[PDB]
Amino acid sequence: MTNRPDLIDEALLRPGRLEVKMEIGLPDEKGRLQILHIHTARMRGHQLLSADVDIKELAVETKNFSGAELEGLVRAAQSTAMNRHIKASLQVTRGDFLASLIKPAFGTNQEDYASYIMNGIIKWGDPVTRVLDDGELLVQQTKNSDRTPLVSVLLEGPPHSGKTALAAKIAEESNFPFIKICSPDKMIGFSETAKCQAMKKIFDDAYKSQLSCVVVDDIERLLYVPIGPRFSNLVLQALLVLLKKAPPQGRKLLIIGTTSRKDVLQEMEMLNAFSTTIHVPNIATGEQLLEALELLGNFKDKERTTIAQQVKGKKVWIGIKKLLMLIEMSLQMDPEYRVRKFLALLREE
Amino acid sequence: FEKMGIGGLDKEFSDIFRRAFASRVFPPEIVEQMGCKHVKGILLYGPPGCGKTLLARQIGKMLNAREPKVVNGPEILNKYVGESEANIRKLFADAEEEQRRLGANSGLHIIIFDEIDAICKQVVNQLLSKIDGVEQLNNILVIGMTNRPDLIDEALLRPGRLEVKMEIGLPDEKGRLQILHIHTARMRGHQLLSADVDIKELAVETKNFSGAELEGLVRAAQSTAMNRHIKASLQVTRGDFLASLIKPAFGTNQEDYASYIMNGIIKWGDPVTRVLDDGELLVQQTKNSDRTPLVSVLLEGPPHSGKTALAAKIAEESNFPFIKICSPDKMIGFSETAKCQAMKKIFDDAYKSQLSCVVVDDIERLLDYVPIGPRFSNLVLQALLVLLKKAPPQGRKLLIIGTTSRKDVLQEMEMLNAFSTTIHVPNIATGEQLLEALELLGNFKKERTTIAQQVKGKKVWIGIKKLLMLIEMSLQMDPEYRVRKFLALLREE
Amino acid sequence: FEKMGIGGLDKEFSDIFRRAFASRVFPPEIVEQMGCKHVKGILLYGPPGCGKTLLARQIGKMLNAREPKVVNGPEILNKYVGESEANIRKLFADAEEEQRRLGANSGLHIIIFEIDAICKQVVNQLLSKIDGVEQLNNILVIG
Ligand SMILES: Nc1ncnc2c1ncn2[C@@H]1O[C@H](COP(=O)(O)OP(=O)(O)OP(=O)(O)O)[C@@H](O)[C@H]1O
Ligand SMILES: Nc1ncnc2c1ncn2[C@@H]1O[C@H](COP(=O)(O)OP(=O)(O)OP(=O)(O)O)[C@@H](O)[C@H]1O
Ligand SMILES: Nc1ncnc2c1ncn2[C@@H]1O[C@H](COP(=O)(O)OP(=O)(O)O)[C@@H](O)[C@H]1O
Ligand SMILES: Nc1ncnc2c1ncn2[C@@H]1O[C@H](COP(=O)(O)OP(=O)(O)O)[C@@H](O)[C@H]1O
């Protein structure tokens, strides 16, 4: 028995000895239904399970649950029912199952996306709609089409433009069973020969789900300082080889990237590994600014006109994140001076 | 429940009881009917001194089980005389001895494995087999405790073993009030505590006090009362509490700030007011709003301009419970791989408080910058660039301030795009500012007009610290030459 | 006080006495009536030759306690014949011997421990012995 079929040496596999092999993978929906039916046999035999439970719903709710997690779920549900009974003819009921529903290892986690998706998305113009539409088309292509198992993409733009939120919003809507994020701020102090292992291990999980999606954000930090070109070669090679590896037969992927320095990447021969690329621009006209201000919902009509009468004349160039920072800061002044200070600050860029 | 004397652990205790002990107290016939095994592990983690062991021992007595036996990680690790397996076996020996002697209905035996982070390396196998293997003991329970949750390896966490986790954090105000009410019970019972003490005030004065500090405070107050009585029907009173009020670990110490804030601040002109007002606005924003849990800023300007004092002043006026300074003169001679650890550890503590502020000063000396051919450190630069955008765990807040005298060199390294906003601290640039500074300090007297007649003609360019140095030096002359020498020295700049 | 042969250490002695020993001289009934644990350690630091050990010994005689026994850091550190633990155990031998046999009324014993070499940037066994499952109320450790 082993979890690493690669590292066994050839000596044991030649015929006459250890002649057979098999793979025991994650069960699919029928397997899950059968395991659930197996584990709750005795309770239904003695009539402690209520009549409202329907196994076929748990069969479809628990995606990418392994063998042991189902048993754990049932045990936790029974424990919760007992506790409720004792008050801190009992019958485990649907509510306990819902409440109890454990963390799957190969499933989805909520805390990470909560951390990378902070204030959602606000449609302040055409570019946002265009980017969302392209993301949706890519997700559909990877889910339905059969001639393209692997699909890649790279979002890029100026600093403070709104990339990471867009990537997490595109990925989190796919409803794929397996979603994972590889980030540079989980590897503070690691050496290069540990970054390679971490990346490889993260990738070697997405090959064991019938669908998946992986996020690689801030590529420039995984490698770069321009006081003399200094970077790492090991990480660059392992990343350049992993972006064209194909999964085993019948499984599908989707790798979304991110970066703020496109020219440096172009020089290093990396723009030819990503299938396609997308641009995320900055605010460029007063009308976009007024749209964003109205959507956020901070200033009122009279302040709106006061700001418009001045801002409309010139054109501006400011990322969305900076506009959120400033409009948040100005609010702390007394109600008299909010408009004046906000206009002064914006005028300083 | 109050008899165990645990306060501030209502939710954690409730959930632990629900998940881990509901089965064992239910009538045996029904649980035998449903045929569900019992949990077989618990993992507690948090900052040191918050009440983990005192919870395990009370959980031990709650079930009316046998008294526990303890173990320590490094103590077991170093034994390599053939005892590495013997220790593991002997601990469980009694459990299986009684299981065979009676059977399945033997009473449960607890064992407490402290410092479990040491066993797991980023000895294990035998323990793991014994807790769950071909043979199993249905009459044991294991409780782990640790302070470094990350370094436990995945092997112990898969379901079926050490199935539960809980986090024991610093108490909030209600927890502190309850602990204080717990610890002074007996004295008030025997009427030795005076009638002037009000616990609700100590509840609001002791911010970010952990579990043990409150007990230490009470003991120190009692000692002071005794000492007063004996003169170097006694009653501890408010004065003893105030006098005794111990140095917290996650709190504010005045000594550092005394060292960096030496002579206050003098409003000699508009830029000072501008800087202070901007600091106040930033503090308010990071305190009140919930759409920006991280805010950064960088004060920069020419040498000898007055940066460190303003940063410290802004920090101290906030009133945040947790304040710290990461300065590069506490690391004389360290190698790079120790600077990284020191910085990481200074940051990793600010995440365990509901508010905080961290001041990074003299950036260019952390990197070891020297312009005779560009030499610097890459480990520190990377470890510092990653941390300036790390977001704190859910519901907490953080504010970082910077400092530097070489801006453009930083701009070349692509660092200014990590700091949200920047401020400028200018020097003295007109004779009026110079006269106002001289008057505010209050050193010279007629001599003011003598100085003005000459200074007013020209424009000057001199930092505030240098001016303080000159005006302090000239005073040692005899009285009738002071003004003359002050002019001479200044004219050399 | 002047019979102790110490001058220029009034403040330090007074503060140490107040914080560490005020409870050990008050009538036993009252201190038992309030339920307070006794302090279990001290730390004295300074430049060489300013009068530290002579204060430890004088404090030893102040309480009328049993005479102390001393140890040296680098001496203990090098011993790796399995006695790294046996030495530590036999150090507190007398206090352990008397505690289980006389309880509250035991006569407190002292030990004088270069503690900075041990703490490197053998700690754990000593730490457990001073405060572990067992907690002798008749020991006092001065570093
Ligand atoms: N349409 C939008 N697109 C992107 N972000 C938006 C939008 N509307 C509001 N936001 C908010 O703007 C912020 C986006 O910042 P983001 O995480 O994209 O930074 P970033 O571009 O990666 O920064 P940096 O270059 O400094 O690393 C989030 O707080 C998000 O909620
Ligand atoms: N308005 C003011 N702003 C700053 N410092 C002031 C002001 N008024 C008086 N001072 C005094 O000026 C001194 C400031 O020196 P400071 O500690 O800022 O040096 P620094 O800028 O860190 O030095 P360096 O550039 O050499 O590293 C303090 O002694 C402070 O009391
Ligand atoms: N409710 C409480 N929370 C935290 N500490 C408490 C509480 N009540 C009492 N204490 C005191 O805290 C001290 C230290 O607890 P300890 O068991 O050492 O925790 P840890 O092992 O995490 O340091 C104990 O000696 C105890 O008297
Ligand atoms: N008041 C005093 N302060 C300091 N040293 C004193 C005082 N009175 C006497 N001594 C001398 O100090 C010497 C002992 O110093 P010692 O305790 O060995 O220093 P250390 O504690 O650094 O080893 C004795 O020889 C004694 O004569």
Residue numbers in the entry:
A (entry chain F): 372 to 459, 472 to 484, 488 to 609, 611 to 736
B (entry chain E): 215 to 336, 350 to 459, 472 to 484, 488 to 687, 689 to 736
C (entry chain D): 215 to 327, 329 to 336, 350 to 371
Structure paper excerpt:
The disassembly requires multiple ATP hydrolysis events in the presence of Mg2+; as few as six ATP hydrolysis events are sufficient.
We observed a similar coordinated opening of the D1 and D2 rings for the mammalian homolog NSF after processing substrate. We found that both could process the species-ortholog SNARE complex, albeit at different rates, further corroborating the interchangeability of NSF and Sec18. Thus, the heptameric state, which is unable to process substrate, may not occur in the cell, as there is likely an abundance of cis-SNARE substrate and ATP to capture.
